[PDB]
Short mmCIF file of C-alpha atoms and ligand atoms in Angstrom, two decimals:
data_model
loop_
_atom_site.label_atom_id
_atom_site.label_comp_id
_atom_site.label_asym_id
_atom_site.label_seq_id
_atom_site.Cartn_x
_atom_site.Cartn_y
_atom_site.Cartn_z
CA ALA A 1 95.88 109.89 38.18
CA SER A 2 99.67 109.71 38.14
CA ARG A 3 100.32 112.07 35.22
CA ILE A 4 99.08 115.39 33.79
CA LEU A 5 98.71 116.20 30.06
CA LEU A 6 101.01 118.94 28.87
CA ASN A 7 100.20 121.31 25.99
CA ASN A 8 102.85 119.54 23.94
CA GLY A 9 100.63 116.46 24.08
CA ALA A 10 102.99 114.55 26.43
CA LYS A 11 102.15 113.32 29.94
CA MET A 12 104.07 114.53 33.02
CA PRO A 13 104.18 112.58 36.29
CA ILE A 14 102.71 114.77 38.98
CA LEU A 15 105.23 113.52 41.55
CA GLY A 16 108.96 113.96 40.90
CA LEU A 17 112.18 113.80 42.95
CA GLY A 18 114.03 117.03 43.63
CA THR A 19 117.83 117.14 43.55
CA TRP A 20 118.87 120.65 44.66
CA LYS A 21 121.35 120.25 47.55
CA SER A 22 121.44 116.48 47.07
CA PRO A 23 125.10 115.70 47.70
CA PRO A 24 126.91 114.28 44.70
CA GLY A 25 128.01 111.27 46.79
CA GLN A 26 124.43 110.45 47.84
CA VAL A 27 122.32 111.46 44.85
CA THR A 28 123.10 108.41 42.71
CA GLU A 29 121.73 106.19 45.47
CA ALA A 30 118.79 108.52 46.00
CA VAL A 31 117.68 108.39 42.31
CA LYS A 32 118.07 104.60 42.08
CA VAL A 33 115.94 104.14 45.18
CA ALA A 34 113.37 106.62 43.86
CA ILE A 35 113.07 104.79 40.55
CA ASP A 36 112.89 101.47 42.35
CA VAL A 37 110.08 102.82 44.51
CA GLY A 38 108.06 104.23 41.60
CA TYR A 39 109.23 107.74 40.75
CA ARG A 40 109.41 108.45 37.06
CA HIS A 41 110.20 112.18 37.17
CA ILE A 42 113.48 113.70 38.30
CA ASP A 43 113.97 117.44 38.58
CA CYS A 44 117.54 118.50 37.73
CA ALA A 45 119.62 121.56 37.01
CA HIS A 46 123.17 122.34 35.84
CA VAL A 47 123.49 124.85 38.68
CA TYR A 48 122.94 122.00 41.20
CA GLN A 49 126.34 120.64 40.16
CA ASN A 50 125.24 117.01 40.47
CA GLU A 51 123.74 116.19 37.07
CA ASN A 52 126.58 113.72 36.39
CA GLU A 53 125.74 111.57 39.41
CA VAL A 54 122.01 111.78 38.73
CA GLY A 55 122.79 110.49 35.25
CA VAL A 56 124.71 107.51 36.60
CA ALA A 57 121.57 106.44 38.43
CA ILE A 58 119.29 106.89 35.43
CA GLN A 59 121.72 104.99 33.26
CA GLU A 60 122.03 102.06 35.66
CA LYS A 61 118.28 101.66 36.03
CA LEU A 62 117.89 101.77 32.28
CA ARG A 63 120.68 99.28 31.91
CA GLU A 64 119.13 96.99 34.52
CA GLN A 65 115.71 97.26 32.77
CA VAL A 66 113.99 98.53 35.87
CA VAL A 67 112.55 101.25 33.60
CA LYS A 68 112.55 102.23 29.92
CA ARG A 69 113.51 105.74 28.78
CA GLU A 70 109.99 106.52 27.52
CA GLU A 71 108.62 105.87 30.99
CA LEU A 72 110.94 108.50 32.44
CA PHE A 73 110.27 112.26 32.59
CA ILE A 74 113.61 114.04 33.08
CA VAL A 75 113.67 117.82 33.67
CA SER A 76 116.55 120.29 33.61
CA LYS A 77 116.91 124.12 33.51
CA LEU A 78 119.07 126.61 31.63
CA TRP A 79 121.09 128.60 34.17
CA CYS A 80 121.11 132.47 34.12
CA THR A 81 124.65 132.81 32.66
CA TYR A 82 123.60 131.03 29.50
CA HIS A 83 120.62 133.13 28.26
CA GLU A 84 122.62 134.37 25.26
CA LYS A 85 121.37 132.81 22.03
CA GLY A 86 124.82 131.43 21.30
CA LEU A 87 125.09 129.70 24.65
CA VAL A 88 121.78 127.85 25.05
CA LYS A 89 122.34 124.74 22.88
CA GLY A 90 125.72 123.99 24.43
CA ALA A 91 124.29 124.52 27.90
CA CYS A 92 121.62 122.03 26.99
CA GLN A 93 124.11 119.57 25.52
CA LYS A 94 126.30 119.71 28.61
CA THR A 95 123.24 118.79 30.68
CA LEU A 96 122.32 115.92 28.26
CA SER A 97 125.85 114.56 28.37
CA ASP A 98 126.00 114.82 32.19
CA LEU A 99 122.61 113.09 32.57
CA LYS A 100 123.64 110.64 29.83
CA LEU A 101 120.44 111.31 27.86
CA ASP A 102 119.88 112.06 24.18
CA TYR A 103 116.86 114.17 25.00
CA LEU A 104 115.18 116.00 27.86
CA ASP A 105 111.46 115.66 28.47
CA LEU A 106 111.36 119.22 29.74
CA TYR A 107 113.87 122.05 29.74
CA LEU A 108 113.15 125.27 31.66
CA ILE A 109 114.57 128.77 31.73
CA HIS A 110 115.57 128.52 35.39
CA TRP A 111 115.01 132.22 36.21
CA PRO A 112 113.78 135.06 34.00
CA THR A 113 117.03 136.94 34.73
CA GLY A 114 120.07 136.72 32.47
CA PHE A 115 123.51 137.02 34.04
CA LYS A 116 126.87 137.93 32.51
CA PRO A 117 128.40 134.79 30.92
CA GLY A 118 131.51 133.23 32.39
CA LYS A 119 132.70 130.48 34.74
CA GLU A 120 130.91 132.15 37.66
CA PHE A 121 127.16 131.28 38.23
CA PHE A 122 126.57 134.45 40.13
CA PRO A 123 129.04 136.97 38.68
CA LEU A 124 129.25 139.95 40.95
CA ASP A 125 130.44 143.54 40.68
CA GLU A 126 132.60 145.14 43.38
CA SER A 127 129.41 145.89 45.40
CA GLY A 128 128.31 142.25 45.30
CA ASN A 129 125.46 143.06 42.97
CA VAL A 130 124.78 140.43 40.36
CA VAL A 131 126.07 141.45 36.93
CA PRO A 132 123.20 141.33 34.41
CA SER A 133 123.38 140.26 30.83
CA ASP A 134 121.77 142.39 28.12
CA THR A 135 119.63 139.48 26.93
CA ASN A 136 115.88 139.53 27.16
CA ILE A 137 113.46 136.71 27.95
CA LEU A 138 111.90 136.78 24.42
CA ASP A 139 115.15 136.00 22.54
CA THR A 140 116.01 133.46 25.17
CA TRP A 141 112.67 131.80 24.56
CA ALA A 142 113.35 131.71 20.80
CA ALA A 143 116.58 129.85 21.58
CA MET A 144 114.67 127.39 23.73
CA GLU A 145 112.27 126.82 20.80
CA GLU A 146 115.18 125.81 18.56
CA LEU A 147 116.07 123.01 21.00
CA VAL A 148 112.62 121.51 20.36
CA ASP A 149 113.15 121.83 16.61
CA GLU A 150 116.53 120.08 16.92
CA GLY A 151 115.15 117.14 18.89
CA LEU A 152 117.16 117.82 22.07
CA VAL A 153 114.12 118.48 24.30
CA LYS A 154 110.53 117.33 23.97
CA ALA A 155 109.06 120.37 25.72
CA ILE A 156 110.14 123.75 26.96
CA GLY A 157 109.11 125.82 29.96
CA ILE A 158 109.88 128.56 32.44
CA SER A 159 110.56 128.86 36.17
CA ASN A 160 110.16 131.78 38.58
CA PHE A 161 108.36 133.83 35.93
CA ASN A 162 105.70 136.23 37.18
CA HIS A 163 102.35 136.56 35.43
CA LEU A 164 103.54 139.57 33.43
CA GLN A 165 106.64 137.67 32.24
CA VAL A 166 104.49 134.67 31.40
CA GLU A 167 102.25 137.05 29.48
CA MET A 168 105.25 138.52 27.65
CA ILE A 169 106.08 135.09 26.23
CA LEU A 170 102.49 134.19 25.37
CA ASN A 171 102.28 137.49 23.56
CA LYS A 172 105.79 137.23 22.03
CA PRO A 173 105.90 138.13 18.33
CA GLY A 174 106.12 134.96 16.29
CA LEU A 175 105.76 132.70 19.33
CA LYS A 176 106.09 129.10 18.14
CA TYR A 177 105.74 126.96 21.23
CA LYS A 178 104.00 128.11 24.36
CA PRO A 179 105.61 127.27 27.70
CA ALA A 180 104.44 123.88 28.92
CA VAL A 181 105.24 124.49 32.53
CA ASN A 182 105.90 127.23 34.96
CA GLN A 183 107.86 125.87 37.93
CA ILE A 184 107.44 128.10 41.01
CA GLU A 185 107.80 127.97 44.78
CA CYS A 186 104.53 126.86 46.36
CA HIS A 187 103.57 125.59 49.84
CA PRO A 188 101.05 126.59 52.59
CA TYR A 189 103.11 129.72 53.47
CA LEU A 190 103.32 130.75 49.76
CA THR A 191 100.04 129.54 48.25
CA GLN A 192 100.21 131.40 44.90
CA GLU A 193 96.49 131.39 44.06
CA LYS A 194 96.79 134.21 41.56
CA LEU A 195 99.82 133.05 39.59
CA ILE A 196 98.56 129.51 39.59
CA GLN A 197 95.12 130.43 38.29
CA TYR A 198 96.72 132.58 35.58
CA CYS A 199 98.93 129.78 34.34
CA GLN A 200 96.27 127.07 34.43
CA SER A 201 93.87 129.33 32.57
CA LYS A 202 96.41 129.37 29.72
CA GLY A 203 96.98 125.63 29.71
CA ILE A 204 100.39 125.99 31.42
CA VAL A 205 101.04 123.34 34.06
CA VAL A 206 102.45 124.56 37.35
CA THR A 207 105.13 122.64 39.22
CA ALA A 208 105.47 123.36 42.91
CA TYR A 209 109.01 123.55 44.27
CA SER A 210 110.13 123.56 47.93
CA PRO A 211 106.83 121.88 48.97
CA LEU A 212 108.24 121.09 52.43
CA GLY A 213 109.76 124.52 53.03
CA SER A 214 113.30 123.47 52.09
CA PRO A 215 114.48 122.80 55.64
CA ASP A 216 118.00 122.26 54.27
CA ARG A 217 118.16 125.62 52.46
CA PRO A 218 121.62 127.10 53.14
CA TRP A 219 120.36 130.50 54.39
CA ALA A 220 117.79 129.33 56.95
CA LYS A 221 117.16 131.71 59.83
CA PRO A 222 115.90 131.03 63.37
CA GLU A 223 112.62 132.96 63.30
CA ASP A 224 111.77 131.62 59.82
CA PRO A 225 108.44 129.77 59.68
CA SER A 226 108.70 125.94 59.62
CA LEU A 227 106.02 123.97 57.72
CA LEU A 228 107.21 120.61 58.90
CA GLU A 229 106.87 121.72 62.51
CA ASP A 230 103.62 123.66 62.14
CA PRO A 231 101.28 122.20 64.77
CA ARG A 232 98.27 123.02 62.61
CA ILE A 233 99.67 121.05 59.68
CA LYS A 234 100.73 118.26 61.99
CA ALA A 235 97.15 117.99 63.23
CA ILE A 236 95.76 117.51 59.71
CA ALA A 237 98.40 114.86 59.20
CA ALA A 238 97.49 113.06 62.38
CA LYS A 239 93.83 113.17 61.45
CA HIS A 240 94.70 111.37 58.22
CA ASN A 241 97.14 108.90 59.73
CA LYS A 242 99.86 110.32 57.49
CA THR A 243 103.06 112.24 57.99
CA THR A 244 103.34 115.99 57.75
CA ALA A 245 105.43 115.70 54.58
CA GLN A 246 102.73 113.50 53.02
CA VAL A 247 100.13 116.13 53.65
CA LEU A 248 102.47 118.80 52.23
CA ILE A 249 103.02 116.72 49.06
CA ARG A 250 99.40 115.74 48.67
CA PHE A 251 98.36 119.38 49.02
CA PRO A 252 99.61 120.70 45.60
CA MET A 253 98.59 117.44 43.88
CA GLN A 254 94.94 118.26 44.65
CA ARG A 255 95.40 121.70 43.09
CA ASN A 256 96.28 120.05 39.74
CA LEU A 257 99.95 120.89 40.33
CA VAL A 258 103.09 118.85 39.83
CA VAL A 259 105.26 118.58 42.96
CA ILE A 260 108.92 117.64 43.41
CA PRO A 261 109.93 117.01 47.04
CA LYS A 262 113.67 116.56 47.53
CA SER A 263 115.23 113.85 49.63
CA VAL A 264 118.40 111.74 49.79
CA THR A 265 117.03 109.59 52.61
CA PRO A 266 115.69 106.28 51.24
CA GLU A 267 112.99 105.96 53.92
CA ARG A 268 111.77 109.46 53.14
CA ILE A 269 112.04 108.94 49.39
CA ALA A 270 109.67 106.01 49.82
CA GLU A 271 107.32 107.78 52.27
CA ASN A 272 107.10 110.74 50.01
CA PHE A 273 105.68 108.65 47.08
CA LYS A 274 102.92 107.09 49.19
CA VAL A 275 100.51 109.95 48.70
CA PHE A 276 98.11 108.45 46.20
CA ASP A 277 96.09 106.48 48.73
CA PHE A 278 94.43 109.28 50.72
CA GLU A 279 92.52 112.53 50.11
CA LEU A 280 92.55 115.94 51.76
CA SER A 281 89.03 117.30 52.07
CA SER A 282 88.05 120.69 50.64
CA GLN A 283 88.10 122.02 54.18
CA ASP A 284 91.66 120.79 54.75
CA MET A 285 92.64 122.36 51.43
CA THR A 286 91.14 125.73 52.32
CA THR A 287 92.60 125.49 55.82
CA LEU A 288 96.07 124.83 54.39
CA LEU A 289 95.56 127.69 51.94
CA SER A 290 94.74 129.94 54.87
CA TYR A 291 98.32 129.65 56.20
CA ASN A 292 99.70 131.82 53.40
CA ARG A 293 102.32 134.32 54.58
CA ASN A 294 104.00 135.22 51.24
CA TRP A 295 107.20 133.64 52.64
CA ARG A 296 109.82 132.68 50.07
CA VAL A 297 112.63 130.16 50.30
CA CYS A 298 114.05 131.35 47.01
CA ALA A 299 114.25 135.06 46.31
CA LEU A 300 117.94 135.97 46.19
CA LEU A 301 118.07 139.57 47.26
CA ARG A 302 121.25 140.40 45.39
CA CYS A 303 119.21 140.21 42.20
CA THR A 304 116.62 142.76 43.27
CA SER A 305 117.92 145.37 40.85
CA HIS A 306 117.72 143.09 37.82
CA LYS A 307 115.22 144.56 35.36
CA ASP A 308 113.52 141.15 35.14
CA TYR A 309 113.64 140.36 38.89
CA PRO A 310 110.34 138.53 39.18
CA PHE A 311 109.19 139.32 42.67
CA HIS A 312 108.44 143.07 42.95
CA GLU A 313 105.14 142.58 41.19
CA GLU A 314 102.27 141.26 43.33
CA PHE A 315 102.08 138.07 41.33
N1 NAP B 1 113.13 126.21 39.97
C1 NAP B 1 113.91 126.66 40.94
O1 NAP B 1 114.25 127.82 41.11
C2 NAP B 1 113.91 125.76 42.17
C3 NAP B 1 114.16 126.34 43.46
C4 NAP B 1 114.15 125.53 44.60
C5 NAP B 1 113.90 124.14 44.46
N2 NAP B 1 113.68 123.62 43.16
C6 NAP B 1 113.48 122.13 42.97
O2 NAP B 1 112.45 121.68 43.89
C7 NAP B 1 112.99 120.60 44.73
C8 NAP B 1 112.35 120.57 46.12
O3 NAP B 1 112.70 121.82 46.80
P1 NAP B 1 113.77 121.96 47.93
O4 NAP B 1 114.99 121.10 47.70
O5 NAP B 1 114.05 123.44 47.99
O6 NAP B 1 113.11 121.52 49.34
P2 NAP B 1 111.95 120.56 49.86
O7 NAP B 1 111.78 119.43 48.92
O8 NAP B 1 110.83 121.41 50.24
O9 NAP B 1 112.62 120.03 51.23
C9 NAP B 1 113.78 119.20 51.10
C10 NAP B 1 114.25 119.01 52.58
O10 NAP B 1 113.22 118.19 53.20
C11 NAP B 1 113.69 117.03 53.78
N3 NAP B 1 112.74 115.97 53.65
C12 NAP B 1 112.30 115.27 52.54
N4 NAP B 1 111.34 114.42 52.78
C13 NAP B 1 111.14 114.57 54.15
C14 NAP B 1 110.21 113.88 54.94
N5 NAP B 1 109.34 112.96 54.52
N6 NAP B 1 110.22 114.23 56.29
C15 NAP B 1 111.08 115.18 56.80
N7 NAP B 1 111.98 115.85 56.00
C16 NAP B 1 111.98 115.51 54.66
C17 NAP B 1 114.98 116.75 53.02
O11 NAP B 1 115.85 116.00 53.90
P3 NAP B 1 116.83 114.81 53.34
O12 NAP B 1 117.22 115.13 51.93
O13 NAP B 1 117.94 114.85 54.38
O14 NAP B 1 115.93 113.55 53.46
C18 NAP B 1 115.56 118.17 52.74
O15 NAP B 1 116.26 118.67 53.88
C19 NAP B 1 114.53 120.93 44.72
O16 NAP B 1 115.35 119.95 45.25
C20 NAP B 1 114.70 121.29 43.24
O17 NAP B 1 114.61 120.06 42.50
C21 NAP B 1 113.67 124.39 42.00
O1 ZST B 2 117.54 128.13 41.77
C1 ZST B 2 117.41 127.02 42.39
O2 ZST B 2 116.75 126.11 41.83
C2 ZST B 2 117.56 127.05 43.87
C3 ZST B 2 118.50 128.23 44.18
N1 ZST B 2 117.88 129.27 44.61
N2 ZST B 2 118.69 130.31 45.03
C4 ZST B 2 117.94 131.48 45.51
C5 ZST B 2 117.86 132.29 44.13
N3 ZST B 2 117.12 133.35 43.97
C6 ZST B 2 117.19 133.92 42.69
C7 ZST B 2 116.51 135.05 42.21
C8 ZST B 2 116.75 135.42 40.89
C9 ZST B 2 116.03 136.63 40.35
F1 ZST B 2 115.25 136.18 39.30
F2 ZST B 2 115.02 136.99 41.13
F3 ZST B 2 116.68 137.61 39.87
C10 ZST B 2 117.59 134.76 40.02
C11 ZST B 2 118.26 133.65 40.46
C12 ZST B 2 118.03 133.27 41.79
S1 ZST B 2 118.72 131.95 42.60
C13 ZST B 2 120.07 130.29 45.05
O3 ZST B 2 120.75 131.22 45.42
C14 ZST B 2 120.69 129.10 44.55
C15 ZST B 2 122.09 129.05 44.54
C16 ZST B 2 122.69 127.89 44.06
C17 ZST B 2 121.92 126.80 43.62
C18 ZST B 2 120.55 126.85 43.63
C19 ZST B 2 119.92 128.04 44.11
#
């Protein structure tokens, strides 16, 4: 099926379009094409600095009556320099105004770590360490709950939270809404069995990011593994008469995950949605799972000293 039921009683499309690194002069086209081609979920964030252009696309397709707003599932994230209680609603409203929406279907705390507020997204000290904010995840979550109670967002969630930080929220005193989603990195080199089982056992839907290994990540290094070029993954693809990306997108779908491949290439945007007509076998799934290397696209090492840095813990 195309959607998964969230614990807020809404349905989330299991395939969405990613927008991190999508250039502001190509992302309007990319989102139009995606909607034309069937996508109903767009993954956004203020920190991606292109929400305005994404919004233009959404608006035009609504205007054109290609889609209705209820059919869309639009997701954004609160950036780290806005975890202070007084900053969350305006952060959300900026996103709404940029995307030209009057509500978000899902709004996530982008990272468990709060940073010092200001103009700077990664405020640094004279040793290039990120400057923390004294906020904690629990008060931040309480501020996300108010957005639900004010009608600005239909559901709230988390991203890059480890199982202990998920547990902190579920066990938060006076918790009012549980997280609907945990959005984490997940692909055959970072399979996440443990964190995924934890979350699903609690009725928290997991969204897999960087499902293709983020080949356009800005810090790519030569000896880094490459999913797209992995001969073993290519062989499974060939066996199924599909592309490697198709296998890499279909792979988290069969784990009951949501997946958001990024592309600005219209041929790829199309290709990437054509993943509902074939099935990986259990052997394929276990074989893909066997490629785990605990390799992360996204683990910015200048945050390692943050108290809430999520990746020291095993899972
Ligand atoms: N929560 C967070 O912390 C977080 C972190 C990272 C990512 N995310 C989200 O997850 C989305 C996906 O992750 P990602 O952007 O890191 O990377 P990704 O989706 O794994 O890979 C995107 C790269 O793959 C290429 N590509 C797309 N389809 C392809 C295909 N069929 N064949 C060959 N290459 C293809 C794209 O090229 P072109 O664009 O040139 O076609 C781009 O260079 C992001 O865009 C963002 O929405 C969230
Ligand atoms: O975030 C995006 O979606 C993609 C993303 N990932 N990363 C790697 C990161 N690693 C982190 C680690 C922590 C930490 F929690 F661990 F402290 C906190 C924050 C980050 S950002 C980036 O540095 C980044 C920079 C600009 C725009 C998007 C991103």
